[model samples]
Target: AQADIALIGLAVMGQNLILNMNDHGFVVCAFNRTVSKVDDFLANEAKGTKVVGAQSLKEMVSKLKKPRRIILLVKAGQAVDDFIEKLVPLLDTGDIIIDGGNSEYRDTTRRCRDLKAKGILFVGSGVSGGEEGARYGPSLMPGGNKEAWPHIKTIFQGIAAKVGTGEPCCDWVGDEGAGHFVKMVHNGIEYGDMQLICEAYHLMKDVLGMAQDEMAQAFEDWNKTELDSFLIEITANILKFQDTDGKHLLPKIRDSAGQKGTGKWTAISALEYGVPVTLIGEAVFARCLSSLKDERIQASKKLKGPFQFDGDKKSFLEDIRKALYASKIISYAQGFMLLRQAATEFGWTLNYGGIALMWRGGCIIRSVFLGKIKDAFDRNPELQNLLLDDFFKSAVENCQDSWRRAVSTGVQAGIPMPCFTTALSFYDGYRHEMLPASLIQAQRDYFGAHTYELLAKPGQFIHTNWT
Candidate 1:
């Protein structure tokens, strides 16, 4: 029987997705660069499944039905182009190529355009949810040629995760590059959330001097609340885990974090758009700062912090919770704000609620909080910013005092909570009807003749010779 679709690459993601597709009743033709790996996977992992192990791209293409759909799960950049270059000659016109790796959005845009000229379809599909998610269900974001969606939607939706609403956590994001752009911001937000949680953990362990079990309990508790998400759930389990030596594994791990550049891309994109995505910027910078482990250790011996947190422990924990919630909202707000700007800049009409729903399951940032985000957009589709949304507006308002106290405590304790502090700053700066920007404008005018706008007469730029 002809295969429903062909999947290239037999790495973990490709393997799991092949199995997932097979489970969904789609016959998947699986191929790999190395024929040995393909044979091994077919004999071992794919035994008895509806997955056909194709020894070559020619074999895979021959087995597929008309309007052949091919999913590429290889490394991003040159490898993708190389593989496409190889396949374009063999495949007929109207064949669809889905790039499911974390390729840059611009590359996806270029591929889509280039392929369309050849009478072929290209989709830069963003498949989130790690190894386990790929095997079971993952959030899928496919954006490129809109014409290709109807051809592949059934298979894509069939293998995606479904949330409480019973809707699949997959959507046709928009036109070229939009899917990957959304995923880039998704990962950027992931960076921010991870950093914020780490700071929260630091406060609990360092400031309050809490034990591992206690910290685990706190996270487990948080997971049951509005903060419920895959990351938090895993954090709880990670804290509770003990090695064979019965020692906590967390502290033994290195303090430094590594990156694959998605967070950096998001930050760069934000700057390019002139969007004040301060939380993501700080989050990305925080990783860079952590990368200086040797210098930090050397400075630790010489540098000193306040070393005192005299605040009430229980009260501060509550404050930290509120601050974490408020800051998380701000981080997401910044991400969605970037998406809004990108939609305008890229000429794509993004469905903000649909995007939120896509993140509500399978993805790293999945949380009960996302449901609220979806609702906020549903209530007002034209809502300019998340902070202005009624639910988030009231939530932030209620959290204001606790959020302030938490930031104040971190400052006094000399704990570096850049995400938390920037969240508050972004919030405060955004809500301020009048700001100290007048002085900044005057300063610019005084030094560089940039000029300043008159308050009395808006839109009028005036320069004064104070000298």
Candidate 2:
């Protein structure tokens, strides 16, 4: 029997996704540039499944059912183009091509346009959840080529993770680059979340002088609240983990952090769209700053900070928890604000609530907190900002004092609270009816003759001569 679909890469992600497809009762034909890996994969790893190993692209295409569905899980740049160039001639009209890599959204847009002219459907799908999620169930965001969705929706929805409510973590995101764009923001928010959590841990460890187990317990306790998520759960476990030598593994690990550029791309997109996704931007910058370990060490020797924090340890810990929660909401607000702009800029219709639902499981950002976001959107689909939603508004309002205290204390202690402090600033700026922008407008007009809007007559532009 012909395979239902063909997967064109043999890397761990591709291999696991193929297994996931097989488990969902789809016949998957797998191929690779290196035939030995294909052979090795089928011979041992997929012995029990209905998976077939193909020696070449031709063989893989031939084994797939009519109007072939092919998933490209290779590298994102030129390699994707090269692979597509090879695969273009093998399939018939209406055959679908799915790029499941972290390819740039603009590239995906180009590919969709280019392939559409050839009577082929192109889908830029985002698959998240790492190796385990790929093998069992990952969050799948498939967009572009609307006609191709019906052909593969069953397979994707069947294989995706289902939260306790039984809703699969898969959806038709939109057209062209929408799926990849959403994925890009997901990665950006992931960076923000990690940085925020790390900052919280830093405060507990440095300011409160809490031991590893104690800190781990604190995080574990947090998991029972709104902050409950996969990252927090794992963070707790990571803290309590010990190596075979009986040393804490986390401290033994290097301080430097590594990234693959998705977060940077999201920040760049935010800038392009003129949105202030400050928390994610700081998160990306934080990683860049951490990468300068040698310079940081030398600078620390010259730079001076407070010698110690002699505050109420218990109060400070609770304040940090409130700050983390508030900052997290602000980060999502920034991310969703970007998404809102991108949808308008790209002409893609995005369902903000559905996106939240899709991330509730399988994806890296899965959290109980996402449910609140979904509910917020459900109450008012056109809600401009999450902070405007009553639930979130009240939540943040109740914690604002504590959040301020945490940021102020962290600042005084000379601890870097980039995400935390930025979140607070964003909140303050967002809620204020009046700002000092009049001074900025005057400065711009004085230097560059840039016009300013009149306060009473809002639409009218005026310039002042400041000689």
Candidate 3:
């Protein structure tokens, strides 16, 4: 069979996405190093949809049309390098290969270069929405080798779930790993958002005396308004859930959280690009600190603070809620602003409307606010932040009093609202060209004899030791 596309590795995501492509009238040649996995996909894929099996890389390379499109759904790091080494020998020039795994974006560029030297086109694409989205309409971000985009973009557009006005939920993000980079940052922003919400939950349950149902109601009502994304909706359901014990379980849990590598990757990438993303970094660090079980236990045993909050419950709780909502929006704003700065520095044209549309459903951070974001992007496709709009301005103004009160109360009660505080600082900090890192540089020089640059003179260096 002359296959229009070929997908390697029959991992869960790959298998399901092949099924999605098959259902959409694309005959995909599915291959896996293991025969059983390929057989499993064939056994379970859409009935009447054409799919052929390839036992070896040589066989897979033989079963495709001119300018063949192949997608790698394998593991990242060394495994990808080994697979590419094998595939390059068998594949031809103008034949397009896409790395669709969670491979580090930097590796994608390196791979593209190595392949491009041999006259092959490579694309670094990021896939999200997990199993269900893969089998249905996953959000796609394809970068690298703009020439290859025209070919693969159409296929992705066809398979991607549609948004309002029939816009495809996939896009050509930018050059060489920009797609993965964006997705990487997306996960980081998700980390910050989740932590902020946890802080909100803690404040509501401990400080405000709210039950699960009341919390669920708050999010549900917000869903009907602006915060109605997948996470918030699921959070509302989680709040309303009754365990076998029939009690609100999540609220009783500790205020700590954990994260996978994506958050850390984002922070590292920001440093690599000379960008400031302290809020995301703080969130990542916060999760790491929570993961220190022994240290946390020891600290809990010894560190007890004499603190109490005997404030007006009605007014205080409302104030915390208002402040949290505002801070949450600002946190998101900070993430988008970072992206805007990156795009400008790198000379890439990013479509914010497409970004919001792709994130509309399925994604964890999808929210009612995304609709306005899409509109904002449509009006100004190069918008730096969604908050610059009149709507967001009004919303921010509405939350001012609550924000002030929440910060004051948290400080007074000796409660840590680091997420909120970090968010406030992140917003204020991004608007500046200089940070207190000068003192940090001075400290580095003092401790390690490293040189420091002076702001008073451009292209000049000063050496000093504090001692």
Candidate 4:
């Protein structure tokens, strides 16, 4: 029982997290199914660190401090289940098992149920911030059996990234798969933000005709404002990169986009909940569209539009910036709105304020705006929507005029602004007390005898005939 904790997977994230813990003065036993991976990890990356290697599950668990905590960073599907099956027989009543992979929340929920039956405390955590964050500090979301938190909290907090105010970027989200649910939403939000940025960069290059360095400068400067975020910072750095021959590298890369399905999951969840997460939906579609590279090339050759700019470039650039900010506000408003519905649907009592707090640092979507969200939820824990938050409401109000102008200009310019327009459409629809869905209901009733409700008797469903 010499080791404080142990990790049974030796992938990149596994290695990095082990070293991160070791750096924070914890003794961690590193083990892998492939024993050679363990030897190489200790011999190379984890050399001279307090990361001892264990050859088997029995040995790995035996060396841990009481109430043994072991983290698994293996593949997310059957592999994870097999590893768990192997470990449970070697574990005791009080031992804890943690899944640190990008697993589906439903799977986590089922895993929690299965492990609880045998008296093992299981944690399904979301370890975000990617490679470098793993080695330094990643935002950790661990939630399953609440009993596991008290035993694992110190190690998780001590190794997680911190915000400027000295708060750890790790926290207990809620019961059973809540951590992964939040992480999925986090990734979805990330997809929307990245697409929004790419659109801004697109508008800059095609509409305003700004150079890469200039675009980089714009992104760099925006990082000092309300849009200050990890994505924007890295985007600026990316745009500033140069090749060996001194030309910019970004333009030389292919136009196709890649995704890992979390965005689609969030989109599906939103649809299932009947929440209008339009920006994220559009963002995911945009990626799918981007993937049709050959089709786009053919369309480009066949398509003809006014790509000419005859407006004040400076003001339009400012408008796009405002639009980016405002669209982001709408996007997050929808995201939180969806999360609130999920908490209800999934029977998990999630903390809105705490979710915002952990995303402040050590995560890809880390931004100064998240602090405002934390503050908003702090003021009213039962916040129905972020658009109603005083801070976001005022910010959106100030940017609405410019946001509209930017979308209008993009439309006229024939540049694709799917996410921007969707955000604006959602904003417009959300604010209106009455919508055209009444006509939709009428059509539904006419076609299939579905019932409809009127404002006068909203609670009552009535059938009406239309001639």
* Local accuracy of candidate 4 as per-residue lDDT tens digits, 355-421: 8877767788899999899899999998999999899999999999989988887898889999999
- Model 3 lDDT per residue over 76-95, tens place: 88877888888887877798
1-467 per-residue lDDT for model 2 (tens digits): 38999998889999999999999999999988888998899988788889998998988888988779999999999989998999999879999999999888899989998999998999998888899999999998888888899998999899998889888888888889888888889989999999999999998987788999999999999999989998999999999999999988999888988555558988998999999999999999999988888988999899888757787888889898989999999999999999999988988888788788778678888999998998999999999999999999999998899999888877777789999999999999998899998899989999999989888998888988888
TM-score of each: 0.94, 0.94, 0.87, 0.95
Model 4: number of clashes? 0
For model 3, name the residue pairs that clash.
144-176, 229-366, 229-367
> How well is each residue in 137-216 modelled by candidate 1, as lDDT tens digits?
99998999988999999999999999987888988998899999999999889999999999899889888989998999
Off by over 4 Å in 1: 55-59, 259-261, 307-312, 456-460
Local lDDT at 212 for model 3: 82
In model 2, the clashing pairs are none
Candidate structures ordered by TM-score, highest first? 4, 2, 1, 3
Using TM-score as the measure, which candidate wins? 4
Give the root-mean-square deviation of each candidate in angstroms.
2.1, 2.0, 3.5, 1.8
lDDT of 2 at 389: 96
